[PDB]
Amino acid sequence: NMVPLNPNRIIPDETSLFLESILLHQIIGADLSTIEILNRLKLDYITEFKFKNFVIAKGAPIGKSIVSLLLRCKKTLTLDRFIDTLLEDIAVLIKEISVHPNESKLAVPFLVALMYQIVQFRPSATHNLALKDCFLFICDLIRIYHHVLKVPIHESNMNLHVEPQIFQYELIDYLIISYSFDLLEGILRVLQSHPKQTYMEFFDENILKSFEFVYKLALTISYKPMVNVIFSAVEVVNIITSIILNMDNSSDLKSLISGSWWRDCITRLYALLEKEIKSGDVYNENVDTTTLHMSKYHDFFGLIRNIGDNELGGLISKLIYTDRLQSVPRVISKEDIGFTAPIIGYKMEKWLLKLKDEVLNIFENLLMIYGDDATIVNGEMLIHSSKFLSREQALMIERYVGQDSPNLDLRCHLIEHTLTIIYRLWKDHFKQLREEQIKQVESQLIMSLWRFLVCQTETVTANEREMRDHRHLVDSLHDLTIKDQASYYEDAFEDLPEYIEEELKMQLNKRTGRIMQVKYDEKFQEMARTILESKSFDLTTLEEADSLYISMGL
Amino acid sequence: ESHVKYLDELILAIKDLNSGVDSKVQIKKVPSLKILNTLIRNLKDQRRNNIMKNDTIFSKTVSALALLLEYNPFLLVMKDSNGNFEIQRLIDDFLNISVLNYDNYHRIWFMRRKLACVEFYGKPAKFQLHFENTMNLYEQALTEVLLGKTELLKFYDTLKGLYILLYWFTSEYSTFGNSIAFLDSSLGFTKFDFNFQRLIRIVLYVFDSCYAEIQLKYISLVVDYVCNRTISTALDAPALVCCEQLKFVLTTMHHFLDNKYGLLDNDPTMAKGILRLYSLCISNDFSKCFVDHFPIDQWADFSQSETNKALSIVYFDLKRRSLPVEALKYDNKFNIWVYQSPDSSLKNVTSPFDDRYKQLEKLRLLVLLLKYRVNQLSPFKLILNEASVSIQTCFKTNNITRLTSWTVILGRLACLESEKFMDNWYVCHLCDIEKTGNPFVRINPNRPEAAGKSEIFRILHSNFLSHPNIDEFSESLLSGILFSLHRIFSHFQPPKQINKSFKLVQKCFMNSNRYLRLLSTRIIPLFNISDSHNSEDEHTATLIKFLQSQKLPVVKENLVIAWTQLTLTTSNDVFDTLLLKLIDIFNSDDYSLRIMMTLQIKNMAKIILPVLLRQLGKNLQNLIELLGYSSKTILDIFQRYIIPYAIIQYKSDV
């Protein structure tokens, strides 16, 4: 039952693939090809530059110098070797392109586009030594641009916005900072996706200190926050969590980390999370430290997350003349970039939903991380998690459901997961809770519990008609997508085999009933019951509980 | 058919056996004790090839598993006391069920979502931190191929296995749990993205190194991994999430066409597949995603040489992409055609009742609304009054759907006619978009009214106010017309009407179905905000007398939360005295309610004290303790207290 050999492929060599792919890449949004963008680059105010058989003349073709180095080192190196060689050369490049008085940095970001395409290309057996070389080099690159993410809390009465009005060097350094943090992202996640063996060899307290510099710079509590860097930094925190949940004895890396730094991270996570979601002006500026407003100043995808309008893409192309070797970027209006259809706003409502998914998701993850307690282990997790539960319960019911916009589905799946969070709390972590905390908020926890304890009527459905009516009232947008999906985009959405038309009807029944704020899962209500109706703390003795029992019926 | 009565009694009596009470999970290992044998048997009565040619009865068989395990969540991780769970020893059992569901993709999706179940599957599993073991075996057989020394039937079975594993790692989240390590992160971009992208490189190379209908299904999945993994989150122009995956599938389709086999006749698939694929692609900016990874220059073969009449429509849409003005006016009812000397077929060249849909829809897009949606689903001023008269007719005789088929329309069109202060327009800003602070500081009082200036309300009283439905009918339709009135009055200061509001709120209390409960409360602020008659005067207090006069804690929160929200939302020293009464309601009274009053005090802080403190002191911890985190600051405000009270009271005693 053998299967014969199949070696007669005309195999494209991995090195050749890498080469051609870089050689003709065009990025998501612009108009022009990577290497040739490069071919429109001259590094002028540094009249000579040279590191390792890598001469460039004064007015020389940067881009051709690239393709030169590329091809020559081609018949030198293998795949990984070609990576690390580029990485070192481009690193020296970027470093000096950085440290220079009159130098403009046009090339830097585009080379950072390199950085991505490159390092992403094949992270299979790449070694952390090279990774960290690039990595540290860019973190301290960032501290060479640490003059960004700590710009003040607001425009002062004197601070003007009269301007050269350039979006140029703004977008320049924005791409720089972002792309750079985005490096941090990508290479650090190639770390996390490397074999577990090659891990602690990279982690020193230098990671803590350098990333501590940048984090403090980033998730400001005394400046403007900046949603993209907010993203990046916090997922690096997530990277810490990742190495925790992955290293079997993660106690190694934990002991590496410092208590003050866990604090200066989780506290700023609190600062992040007790902000709010208001699609009302997600696209303007309002109360700060409270709104993740991704303004056009920095609104595109980011080197991974295809977030939306990506409205900067072609403006990436508009940066070079795409006809002449050049050093300083081509002009763009700071304002032409960016009432037609707020459906983009609602794409983003789904995304910032994925963000608060991240918020609760990392908090869950650290929850499971600390099976044993710690110093930042303090219970304010119980407080604030339950607090968020309360607020997205009450304001949920009074505002967001019924507004015929599919944000509510994920807006509720959020707290449906926070249910698991709290139920994790009930099972595991009830050997620390402070009387201090329980009686600082006897209020909100009982609110949370009774939110489903009043839901546990379990007395709605009884037919199709009323709930399908609810649906026709609210589920308009959700059905727009339901019918786009059933009519456009699915194998399963044709030829129901007669055992799933009922699945259609009752699943839509359950989803609409679960849409209108009421009758959540039997699992939900009983798991919450195992917490309150169990008397493990004196929340609920009968003498002060039957007033709620009667307030439910009972 | 055979054990049909047995299954009927089973499902009926076990649905009866929801729990000892309505409290139904049974979170713990339950202390009957007869579900071990039936646990084994529900899957032990199905492995029989004489009962494996029918969809529905096996679907009921697997829904039996759904019920058994769903309502014994103490089954999966039950500590099979070697070291393991029973989700682990259902892994191999459900693999046979997923071999049946390999073909039935619909059933596979359902099974994945169905199977504390998934939470617990990786709750103590992540605490124990089987996956290391399975990944070792995977790498093993994976590398065992590539060179070609595998079985024939483990070949087949596990080739389907590779495809199904790819489908698993490629599906959306909200089904799978976060239980596994490698799904943790969010923003739609979590960890195994790239460990699975490394797995993708691996599968690409190995299967390039790799029965007609087999290749059919193969390219079906080649589409599928990027075809059924969308985040959508939009209107009719939805979102496909990973471009790398997109172009990778494009190039493997290229390699398949290069081989030129897996061509099977009767066209169950070819046409449909290719059509759907390029349709999806078109408008979407990833033209450049397509450009490289797949031109069909060879098998395009549109010289009458070369199922074979379906890649022609993708060639037609590529000519539409060419686009320069040579194209002309719509004649054959097809697209605005172009100079042909050509034009291949009609919008359904091959029309097995679904290919027609896909193509004709896509090609229709070549043309260079929510409000329109339901209108066409049941295919202005004239529309207004024609609606009025036709609804007179519809409530003439016991309609229940096309009758109520007008309420939401009424509302949203009130929104549009307010806006006119219908062309391309749907859900609207104040009507339907939240903001930072108070929704009800957001609303505008001195806006128009309903009486006749809104013929919407004119028809509203015409057919929905003086009706026997308000008396004793339309359990929920009479509610839907009130969500209409919701948005209506939202856009319109109403008159007092409140006769509906009052008995409506008391209804909302009892409610029977807990749907009406806070619904009235949602209603109230509309009445509360007001102008043009008792804007901010007694009107609210008038409601208040009503409300406070209601005292029952039966459906307590209806009585109480709204009681708050009104006064809450109201303006200054008025609501100040109101919150004085509210902190009275929290003062020392109905521990069920004083506490919750504090809860929603925190709530309003989310979205009086000195006066009361001094008062109660003169008269004679929780509140201040919760407020300031410690009561000792009372020194700060003790000024007007110690001086004016605490001594003159009972000159010698106190």
- Identify whether the C-beta of residue B355 lies closer than 8 Å to the C-beta of residue B307: no
Separation of alpha carbons B598 and B609, rounded Å: 12
Determine how many CB atoms are found less than 10 A away from the CB of residue B174: 13
CB contact under 8 A, B515 and A286: no
- Distance of alpha carbon B562 from alpha carbon B568, whole angstroms: 9
**Which tokens go with B197?**
């992208």
Q: Sign (positive/negative) of CA torsion B466, B467, B471, B473?
A: negative
Q: How far apart are CA B391 and CA B394, in angstroms?
A: 5
Q: Indicate yes or no: CB of B27 within 8 angstroms of CB of A526.
A: yes
**What three-state secondary structure class fits A223?**
strand
- A192: nearest CA partner in chain B: B191
| The pair of three-digit structure tokens given for residue B234, joined into one six-digit string | 């939009």
Q: Do A527 and B174 touch (CB under 8 A)?
A: no
Experimental method: cryo-EM
Cβ-based contacts of B521 with chain A (< 8 Å): 398
Cα angle B374-B379-B383, degrees, rounded to a multiple of 5: 80
Position B377: which residue type? L
CA–CA gap between residue B330 and residue B83 (Å, rounded) = 71
- Determine which of A288, A398, A445, A554 to mutate to test the interface with B (most B C-beta atoms within 10 Å): A398
Resolution, given in Å to one decimal, reads 4.7
Phi/psi class of residue A470: alpha, beta or left (left: φ > 0; alpha: ψ in -120 to 50)? alpha
A443 CB neighbours in chain B (<8 A) are: 595, 598-599, 602, 626
Question: What is the distance in angstroms between the Cα of B30 and the nearest Cα belonging to chain A?
Answer: 13
Identify whether the C-beta of residue B487 lies closer than 8 Å to the C-beta of residue B415. yes
Q: Give the DSSP H/E element, type plus range, for residue B49.
A: none
Contacts of A351 in chain B (CB under 8 A): 187-188, 233
A122 — phi, psi (to 5°)? Answer: -150, 90
Nearest Cβ partner for B599 among A403, A413, A443: A443
Nearest residue on chain A to B438, alpha-carbon basis: A399
Q: How many Å apart are CA B311 and CA B274, to the nearest integer?
A: 6
Question: In whole angstroms, what is the distance from residue A393 CA to residue A46 CA?
Answer: 60
Distance from B617 to chain A by nearest Cα, in Å?
23
Q: Is A542 helix (H, G, I), strand (E, B) or coil?
A: helix
Look at the block and give the residue holding tokens 């916090």.
A234
Q: Are A320 and A332 in contact (CB under 8 A)?
A: no
Residue A486 three-state SS: helix
For chain A, how many residues are written?
554
| Residue type at position A88 | E
Question: What is the distance between the alpha carbons of residues B446 and B450, in angstroms, rounded to a whole number?
Answer: 13
Distance CA A294, CA B243 (A): 23
For A226, the 3-state DSSP assignment is: coil
Q: Measured between CB atoms, which of A395, A397, A443 is closest to B595?
A: A443
* Residue B568 backbone zone (phi > 0: left; psi -120 to 50: alpha; other: beta): alpha
| Bridge partners for A276 per DSSP | A291
User: In sequence order, what are the beta bridge partners of A33?
Assistant: A26
Which one of B232, B277, B408, B596 would you mutate to disrupt binding with A, by most A Cβ within 10 Å of its Cβ? Answer: B232
Across the interface, whether the CB atoms of B476 and A465 are under 8 A apart is answered yes
Interface size between A and B, measured as CB pairs under 8 A: 300
Q: Of A368, A466, A485, which is closest to B476 when you measure between CB atoms?
A: A466
CB-based contact A403 B434, cutoff 8 Å? yes
For A3, the closest chain B residue by CA position comes to B148
Spatial CA neighbour of A149 closest among A159, A157, A139? A139
Q: Which residue has the tokens 């070819």?
A: B270
d(CA B354, CA B360): 10
Residue carrying the six token digits 């009933």: A513
Is A245–B374 a contact, with Cβ atoms under 8 angstroms apart? no
Give the whole-angstrom CA distance, residue A364 versus residue A355. 14
Name, in order, each residue with C-beta under 8 angstroms of B87's C-beta and a sequence gap of 6 or more: B76, B77, B121
> Which tokens belong to B125?
């599993």
Q: Which residues of B touch A470 (CB under 8 A)?
A: 476, 515
Q: What separation, in Å, do the N-terminal and C-terminal C-alpha atoms of chain B show?
A: 87
Nearest CB to B25 within list A405, A476, A523: A523
Neighbour tally for A20: CB within 10 Å:
11
Q: Give chain A positions within 8 Å (CB) of B104.
A: 497
B619 min Cα distance to partner chain A (Å)? 26
**How many angstroms separate the Cα of A88 from the Cα of each of A51, A206, A303, A340, B336?**
10, 20, 21, 47, 56
Q: Letter for the amino acid at A18? A: F
Tell me the β-bridge partners of A56. Answer: A49
- Supply A547's token pair: 């007033």
According to DSSP H, which parts of B446-571 are helical?
A: 455-464, 468-472, 477-490, 498-510, 519-528, 538-549, 556-569
In this structure, the dihedral spanned by the alpha carbons of residues A200, A203, A208 and A209, taken in order and rounded to 10 degrees, is 150
The token pair at A104 is 């403009």
Of A341, A420, A519, the CB nearest to B119: A420
What's the rounded Cα separation, in Å, for the pair A134 and A143?
A: 14
**Identity of the residue in B109, B150, B553 whose CB atom sits nearest the CB atom of A3:** B150
- B378 to each of A33, A471, A477, B374, B375, how far by Cα in Å? 50, 16, 17, 6, 6
* Class of residue B309 by CB neighbours under 10 A (exposed 0-12, middle 13-18, buried 19+): middle
| Cβ count within 10 A of residue B146 | 17
Length of chain B: 654
Whether residue B228 and residue A361 make contact (CB cut-off 8 A), yes or no, is: no
Cβ separation of B436 and A342 shorter than 8 Å? no
**Chain B residues within 8 A of A544 when measuring between CB atoms:** 591-592
Q: Which tokens go with B377? A: 């689903």
Whether A547 sits inside 8 A of B515 (CB atoms) is: no
Q: Which of B229, B220, B275 is nearest to B253 (CA)?
A: B220
> Token pair of B509, please?
């209390």
CA dist B365 and B321 (Å) reads: 12
| Rg of chain B over all Cα atoms, to the nearest angstrom | 34
| B148:A5 CB<8 A | yes
CA dihedral B240, B242, B245, B247 (to 10 degrees): 70
Residue B37 CA from chain centroid, whole number: 38
| Interface test mutation site (partner A, options B21, B113, B153, B186, max chain A beta carbons within 10 A) | B186
Mutate to test the interface with B, among A192, A477, A491, A514 (most CBs of B within 10 A): A491
Residue A444 corresponds to which tokens in the numbers above?
């909100």
Contact B567, B541 (CB under 8 A): no
Q: Are the C-beta atoms of residues B247 and A26 closer than 8 Å to each other? A: no
User: CB of A115 within 8 A of CB of A179?
Assistant: yes
Question: What tokens appear for A222 in the block?
Answer: 């005394």
d(CA A526, CA A389): 17
